[PDB]
Structure 1
Amino acid sequence: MKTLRTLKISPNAPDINSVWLYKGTMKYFNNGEWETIG
């Protein structure tokens, strides 16, 4: 339903339409905030 075609390793929040990879976390934009998996 929402395609996230890119993943970006950065200490800053990249974009709504990319996945935010910081040290041991995989955050993405959901419900207006960043939700970490795991």
Structure 2
Amino acid sequence: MKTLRTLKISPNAPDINSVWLYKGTMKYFNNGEWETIG
């Protein structure tokens, strides 16, 4: 119900509507902040 088409590797937050990848984390924008999985 919120499509996220791209994945970006960058040490800084790229965009609301992408998924931020650091070294061993996957942060995505939800609830006004960046929550990581796992």
**TM-score category, normalised to shorter length:** over 0.9
TM-score, normalised to structure 1, is 0.97
Identity within the alignment, %: 100
Q: Which runs of 5+ in 1 are unaligned?
A: none
> After TM superposition, where is structure 1 displaced by more than 4 Å over at least 4 residues in a row?
none
Number of equivalenced pairs = 38
TM-score, normalised to structure 2, is 0.97
Shift of 1:3: 0.3
**Which deviations, in whole Å up to 9, do the C-alpha atoms of 1:1-34 show, x marking residues without a partner?**
0000000000000000000000000000000000
